[PDB]
Amino acid sequence: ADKELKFLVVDDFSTMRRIVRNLLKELGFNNVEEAEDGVDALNKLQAGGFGFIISDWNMPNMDGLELLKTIRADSAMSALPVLMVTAEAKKENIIAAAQAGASGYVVKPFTAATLEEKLNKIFEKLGM
Amino acid sequence: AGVVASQDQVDDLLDSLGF
């Protein structure tokens, strides 16, 4: 994909955001911004220009499921890739995220290989 | 076993359901 694709990394945990942002940078993606929760994330998605979202689930204020649903419901952002990267491993919830239209689902802890594999999978499905 | 403990398990799950 375009090495200038704008990513939004959403997680309440500073350390994890560093992990994800660094992986993107190492993959060639230096245009990366961060949000600490869903409310924050949406405020940021409004200024526009974002091409891909990587989101945590459990966060204060708005969680990653409600955030996914809001993005999918917004005609300005409804087809934007939203990759879930979360500790949340209960089946009924992974199911919920995928029914809500998640582009993929990565469980914590993850390997760099997994993240890369899931990213390249989305790029191809969407022709990015 | 209500919980998944690996990526492969998640992949297999999502796959088994048409995702």
Ligand code: BEF
């Ligand atoms: F807190 Be995240 F959902 F791992």
Ligand SMILES: [Mg+2]
């Ligand atoms: Mg969290």
